[model samples]
Target: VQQFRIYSNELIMKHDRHERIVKLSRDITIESKRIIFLLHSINKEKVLEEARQRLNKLIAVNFRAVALELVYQFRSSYSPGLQEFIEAYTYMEYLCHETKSVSDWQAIQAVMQYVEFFVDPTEYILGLSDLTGELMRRCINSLDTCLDTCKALQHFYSGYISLNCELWRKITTMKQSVLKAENVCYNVKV
Candidate 1:
């Protein structure tokens, strides 16, 4: 346990592009891609919640050194590779809404990390599971325009979250419990 804590404590914020992150969220194409990813797997409630919280952190904290800006942006501009990147973004957008289960969030997180560096996780295909790697490949292959690259990457990050199955089950059970009690009350009254 002590070793686990130490290792976890060592974890640090690596991607910091907040300064530029402020600029891209307003991009319309990126926004579109974001919507698509958000639609991925509504059943993974914990993953969705975590993703939402981290997303809020990214937007709210104003760290100014986040993934979107650093890897996507060049010196005060975007790179030529951005076009392909956006195509990949389009591909990743679909993954968000198409997640398999609660455990899939790890795969999504890996893609997010790669995206922060403006690199393709599918190309590297390490650390990530088969599903994630496959999705990454599709995302990378989806980009067509330079402007689209940033949107594609942003879409991926926007949907990345760690899924917690226990929490999801708890939430679902709680809802069912409430509904069941109401049903019991209805039966007694009838």
Candidate 2:
């Protein structure tokens, strides 16, 4: 009975941990989407910093401890919930391109800053694939930034291709953004 009770309690603790991490990731997803929507306007610059500040607050909310606990408790386990976390929070990683700090959160392992356990690099790579669509959405709506964005996307696409087979699925959306920018740049030529 004692062993069973201890196991039950530990299981509940693990469940709670998953819930907490999922909730934090969901908050991150919501804030990131809001930030992206705000970035869509010609007047986006006016409020972009304020929105970024809010995102930072969301990102900072007890995440370090949660990440540490995740690494500690799940060091020998694989959890599907962690992948959901990678999916939810990585949009912030994607959109942070506008702030020029996208690299910091570009990798899921790096996003947690070395707490690295049970984190799937494959998931992060997939997240980058998802990011291209969001980038394309912004490119279609943004102004002078398109050229710079195109250059960055070209470099990013090059890296994506260099990685070989795993990333080609995202190439289409990335190409769409690049071509759109090329058209815009070509039309404005002297």
Candidate 3:
């Protein structure tokens, strides 16, 4: 009976911790979505500055909350937020650096430096896959310079194909983004 009490107490603690992590994850997702919206709607310099500040703060706080051995165990709870953060961060990087490709290693380094959390490959890929949709929208809006966006989408699509990753659904959507950009470019050129 005493042993059973000990086990039940541990389970209770674990459940409480999981709930805490879930709330933190929710906060991350909300903040990240706001950052994405900011990128799309505001002036370039102002958006970049605000994003950098908010992102650094978000990682330092929420990420720090879950920066323990429980990360792997609670990964599912936090993964959605991490992916959203990656989407926002990578998109911000793309806007800031016109020709630079934001690599997985660069993203890993960016977040790892801020906290001890490990960025899983699946999360990174999924986030970048979402980035394709954003790029496609940008391409359509900026018809004058959309060829460059088309090239970027093409590069991303080819890389995904070569990797042969498990995101088949996202890859299909990515292909559509590439095709849409290509169609836009063709329409503009003619």
Candidate 4:
């Protein structure tokens, strides 16, 4: 950790590219979120192909830098930029599953392989929790997987509370909201 800290500082200071790195991080994050949002559109089949092409471009453009930053700042406090990658990757996983083109769990397996950086489990958990909001949107839009995803979310809610007692209130709120969603899925027509 200490060695990584020093290296990170050296890279950031000696290279004099901190500003560019930060800017690129923000750009990648924004583009990723846009792809996710676009994937939610009614014309998802049409829109997602375009979004995927964009995502591929963004990923190719930033992969080396993100990997370098990860090695430099290994296990630092928080990473807004990397966290966005997590969100984007998780959403991609959902998209891959939805399309069912892969032979196996190739999509998810690729996500794990592609990210060599040290990711915070807390951040990852929170990221997936954030994804529940996107799932909720799709559900409200009448995805057949609505109830299943809600139930899966509830399962995560119960498990996550046990994992982080400190975040009980937040977890409980998530649980309640997901439950409400599940109820509506059963009770009303979309």
Candidate 5:
């Protein structure tokens, strides 16, 4: 009976921790989306700076708490938020440096800068896959004037092809974005 009680207590503790992580993850997802929207709506230098500040706050507050707990045990609860943060972070980098490419694992690690929780390769790839759609939208907004953006999308597509990652769904969306860019380029030439 005592053993059963211990097991029940452990299960309850795990459930409570999972719920807390889920709440924090939701916070991250919402704030990250807002940052992405801000990036899209305005290109002001101050806006970019503000986005950076907000990201720092998110890491410091929500992420720090998640990291203090069992990260892997409750990854499902937090993975979506992490992916969204990566998307917003990468997009901000793209806007800041117009021609810069997506960061590799090392670069991502550097960006995280000794955070308690590490980002998985799958999460990074998925986030970048989402970034392709945003890049495609930028290309469309420029009305065929963003040849460089077109080329970048192509580069990303080819890179995805060479990697044997489990991103079939994301690859499909990425392929569509690449095709959209190609179509824009063709229209510009004609």
Candidate 6:
């Protein structure tokens, strides 16, 4: 999906979701907090520093209400029962193998290129963009925090959600947001 950029277009978003939001507010808070506590454990200064850095990098979350809106477009994605995909040890290992395909290995190389070039302090010096670098770093950290929370929920090898609808919904919503953001930059004129 990262290869499929162009996330800012409304036409793309309109096609991405068919869900409610008000209903998801509580559940989102519930599961996300499971990770938030872990975030809080890091010193407040560190968190703010990271957040400030993230604020400067990529696009600010605050500036992209469309991104937030996309986050909300997933009420249809949640179901009340857990969808079990993992069975015994073999199935669990298989799940890992499938998700970690050769394609993912190639993507990792690309991700490293940008993340290193822009985010690594020792690699280069575009001093003016430090704030941007920091902010984007924080954003990346925040995402890690979410994954940490999911991992903490105990099913680390295979975190299961109570709903399947939410799973697919998130994928679609994220794809939409990426497209929207992409559109914003795709039209830029030099």
User: In TM-score terms, which candidate is top?
Assistant: 5
TM-score of each: 0.22, 0.61, 0.86, 0.65, 0.86, 0.19
Off by over 4 Å in 1: 1-19, 28-34, 37-103, 116-190
- Residues 1-190, candidate 2: write the lDDT tens digits: 5788889997998887766666655555555566656655644355556765664554454254355452445422223233323333444455555533254234544545544333455655655555555566666666466665566566667767676563455676667767776777677674
lDDT of 1 by residue, 1-190 (tens): 5787766555423223433433543342244345335534333456455544544343332222233342333333222122222332333333445332232334444544554233343322211222233343433343222223233333333333233342344334434433443444345455
Off by over 4 Å in 4: 1-18, 67-78, 95-121, 143-145, 166-170
- lDDT (C-alpha) at residue 129 in model 6: 18
Overall lDDT per candidate, in order of appearance: 0.36, 0.54, 0.75, 0.59, 0.74, 0.28
lDDT of each residue in 1-190, candidate 6, tens digit only? 7645665564566554433332343343333333233333333345434432432332221122123342323423222100110011111122123122112223322433443211222111111112122222233344223322222222311212232442344334433433433343343322
- Provide the RMSD of all predictions against the true structure, rounded to 1 decimal: 17.7, 5.6, 2.4, 6.2, 2.3, 22.0
Model 5 misses residue 142 by how many Å? 3.0
Q: Name the runs in model 5 displaced over 4 angstroms.
A: none
The model with the greatest lDDT is 3
Please provide, for model 5 over 31-117, each residue's C-alpha lDDT reduced to its tens digit, 9 standing for 90 to 100.
Answer: 788888887763347878888898878767554654655336778875658788878877777666754565665686665655754
Ranking by lDDT: 3, 5, 4, 2, 1, 6
Candidate 4 structure quality by residue, lDDT tens digits, 26-108: 77677677777776664436676676677667656456445556234433323556566556656655545652222222443
Clashes of each: 23, 0, 0, 0, 0, 20
For model 3, the stretches where C-alpha displacement exceeds 4 angstroms are 42-44, 68-71, 114-116
Q: By TM-score, how accurate is candidate 2?
A: 0.61
Question: Which of the predicted structures, 1 or 2, would earn the higher lDDT when compared with the native?
Answer: 2
lDDT of 3 by residue, 1-190 (tens): 6798889998998898888877878888887888888877623477788788898887775556556543366677756577787788777776666544575756565667666455565677788878777777556656267887888888888878877556898999899889888998888877
Full-model lDDT, candidate 4: 0.59
Candidate 5 TM-score over all chains jointly: 0.86
